[PDB]
Structures are given as structure tokens and as C-alpha cells.
Amino acid sequence: LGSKLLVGYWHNFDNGTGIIKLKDVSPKWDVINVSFGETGGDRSTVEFSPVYGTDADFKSDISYLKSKGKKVVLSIGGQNGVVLLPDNAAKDRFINSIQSLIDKYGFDGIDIALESGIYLNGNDTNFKNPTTPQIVNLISAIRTISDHYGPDFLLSMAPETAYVQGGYSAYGSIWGAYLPIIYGVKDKLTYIHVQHYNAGSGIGMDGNNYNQGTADYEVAMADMLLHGFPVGGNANNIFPALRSDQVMIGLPAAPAAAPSGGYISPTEMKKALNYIIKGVPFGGKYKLSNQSGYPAFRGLMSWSINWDAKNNFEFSNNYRTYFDGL
Numbered sequence: 001l002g003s004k005l006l007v008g009y010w011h012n013f014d015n016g017t018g019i020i021k022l023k024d025v026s027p028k029w030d031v032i033n034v035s036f037g038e039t040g041g042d043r044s045t046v047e048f049s050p051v052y053g054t055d056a057d058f059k060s061d062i063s064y065l066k067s068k069g070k071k072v073v074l075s076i077g078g079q080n081g082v083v084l085l086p087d088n089a090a091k092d093r094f095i096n097s098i099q100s101l102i103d104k105y106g107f108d109g110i111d112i113a114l115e116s117g118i119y120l121n122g123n124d125t126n127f128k129n130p131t132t133p134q135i136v137n138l139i140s141a142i143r144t145i146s147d148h149y150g151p152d153f154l155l156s157m158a159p160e161t162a163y164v165q166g167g168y169s170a171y172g173s174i175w176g177a178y179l180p181i182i183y184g185v186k187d188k189l190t191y192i193h194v195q196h197y198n199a200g201s202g203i204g205m206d207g208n209n210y211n212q213g214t215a216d217y218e219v220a221m222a223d224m225l226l227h228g229f230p231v232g233g234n235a236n237n238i239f240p241a242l243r244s245d246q247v248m249i250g251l252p253a254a255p256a257a258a259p260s261g262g263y264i265s266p267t268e269m270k271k272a273l274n275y276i277i278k279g280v281p282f283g284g285k286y287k288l289s290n291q292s293g294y295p296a297f298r299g300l301m302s303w304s305i306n307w308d309a310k311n312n313f314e315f316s317n318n319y320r321t322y323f324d325g326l
């Protein structure tokens with residue numbers, strides 16, 4: 001896996017942006033997050049059927065991309081990615097179904113983008129030792145699956161900001177609810193790409209409020225993971241920094257890709273990237289936690305490959321060229 005990645009969600013469906021067959025995806029994407037594995041009535045057995053092709057043909061397309069150095073990852077989430085793991089029985093159905101699908105299509109990894117049931121129950125106060133069954137069981141399943149395929153297996157996750165950076169403000173309900181998941185699988189985690197969009201505004205470690213879709217916002221939100229931060233107003237409860245190579249930023253490929261806002265122009269985003277990666281500032285209000293940057297910062301995720309293709313490949317062309325230039 002490369003040191004500066006473009007990770008792109010791939011629609012296993014037509015939402016008006018059309019279907020792009022796997023071999024027609026721009027080679028500028030390093031990782032393709034197939035969207036999505038879904039569940040039926042038991043909210044635990046994951047299912048996936050390709051939107052085009054026989055199973056063999058789809059598997060063959062995946063193999064082709066893999067032969068070209070690309071990674072093809074199964075993403076679990078979306079409106080039908082309702083996953084509830086209230087007990088071990090549910091956990092096992094989830095583990096077994098996911099392994100079956102990985103084995104069947106030859107996916108390179110899994111992407112966890114599910115928020116169903118993700119709440120810290122009352123009393124679940126320690127991110128290093130979670131007690132909420134959904135959280136404990138999800139961690140256990142992810143570890144089990146990861147162990148099944150080893151360190152070449154790719155593990156990513158794509159929570160919204162309230163679940164991660166939100167932990168700076170509160171720890172309970174959804175607030176900080178992905179922190180125990182991140183901590184619980186940090187030794188297996190390839191990268192996390194929080195969704196920096198449909199997000200309104202966020203509070204940085206400087207205690208300042210920043211608006212989504214601005215350079216300062218992207219730096220402030222990423223810095224929480226690059227540096228670590230105190231949780232829930234508790235100076236003695238510090239969530240530790242991830243490795244820089246585990247930190248990515250998730251962005252909309254086009255304005256319409258995130259109808260509630262969050263799109264940032266490449267011109268502005270490159271300012272944020274230069275600051276995060278090299279420690280070169282751009283006159284923004286936010287001060288990076290490290291003087292001279294986080295060189296191993298892993299790159300950008302986008303919703304989505306399909307939206308990007310409809311927007312004249314603005315995202316893929318701009319950021320591939322930016323990263324190649326480093």
C-alpha cells in the first residue's frame with residue numbers, strides 16, 4: 001500500500017450518477033470501497049450481490065484490479081447496512097458472513113461505515129474498556145476478521161465527526177462512540193477516514209469553532225487524530241494519537257456529493273494538505289500541533305468515485321497530481 005492514497009467509494013447501485021464497471025474506474029484511485037454490504041431481517045448476516053456481472057465476472061474484475069496494484073474493499077454501511085450485534089450469536093453471524101463474502105469475491109479488506117446501534121450506554125465511560133455490547137462485539141468481530149486474513153488485510157472505517165472528534169466535547173450516546181472502536185482495533189487499523197462533510201461545524205483542540213468545507217476545519221479535525229486529545233472535558237482522559245499513516249480525511253468529490261455541505265475546493269484543500277503534511281501554513285486561524293508537519297499523513301478518501309466521474313474527475317485529477325508532486 002502506497003504512502004499517499006486516494007480511497008474512493010464505489011456505488012454498487014445507481015443513484016442517478018450511473019454505474020461504473022470496475023475496469024472503467026480511473027486508475028488514479030488506489031483503493032476502491034465497494035458500497036455496500038447490507039443486512040436483512042436479522043441485522044447481522046451481511047449480504048452482497050454485484051450490481052452488474054455474474055459472480056464470476058465481478059470476481060474476475062476484482063482480480064484484474066488487484067493485479068494492477070489496486071485494493072478492493074467491502075464497505076459495510078449505508079441505509080441498508082444496519083448492523084446490530086447485541087449478543088455473541090449476532091456477532092458470529094456477522095463474522096461468518098463477512099468472511100464468506102471476502103472468500104467469495106476476493107476482497108482485499110473491509111471498511112466499517114456503520115452507525116446503527118453505535119451509542120455509548122450509560123456507564124460506558126472508558127474508551128480503553130468499553131461495556132456497550134454493540135461496541136464490544138463490533139471490536140471483537142473486527143479483530144477476529146482481521147486475524148483471519150493477517151496484516152496484509154486492509155481495515156478502514158468512516159465514522160461521522162461526532163463519533164470521533166465529538167469526543168472532545170462529550171463522551172456518551174453517539175458522542176465519542178467510535179473512540180473505543182478505534183482504540184480497540186488500532187493495531188489492526190490500516191487507516192481511518194472520518195467524514196469531514198454533512199458535518200456543520202466542529203470544535204478544534206484550540207477550543208475554536210470551525211466551519212466544514214474550510215481549510216482550517218480540515219486541519220483542526222485531522223489534528224485531533226494526529227496529536228490525540230482530552231476526552232469529554234477531562235484533562236486526565238487523553239485519547240492517544242494514531243500513527244500519521246493511519247490518518248486520512250474523507251471529502252465529498254463534488255458539491256452535490258454531500259447535499260448538507262462539506263465540499264472544499266482543491267485550491268483550499270491543498271493549503272490544508274501542505275500544512276498537515278509539511279507544516280507550511282497558509283494564514284489560517286488554526287495552529288497545527290506539530291511545528292513542521294506530519295509527513296506520513298496517509299491521504300484522502302472521497303464519496304465517491306461515481307460522483308467524481310460526474311464532476312469532470314476534479315477530485316481524482318487534482319489530488320493525484322498534488323500527492324504525486326510530494
Ligand SMILES: CC(=O)N[C@@H]1[C@@H](O)[C@H](O[C@@H]2O[C@H](CO)[C@@H](O)[C@H](O)[C@H]2NC(C)=O)[C@@H](CO)O[C@H]1O
Pocket residue numbers: 009015075077078079080113158195198256257258259303
Ligand atoms: C460510507 C458512507 O457512509 N457513505 C455515505 C453515503 O451513504 C451517502 O451517500 C448516499 O448513499 C445512499 C446509500 O447509502 C444513497 O442512496 C444516496 O443516493 C447517496 N447520496 C448521495 C448524495 O450520493 C453520502 C451522502 O453525502 O455520505 C457518505 O459518506
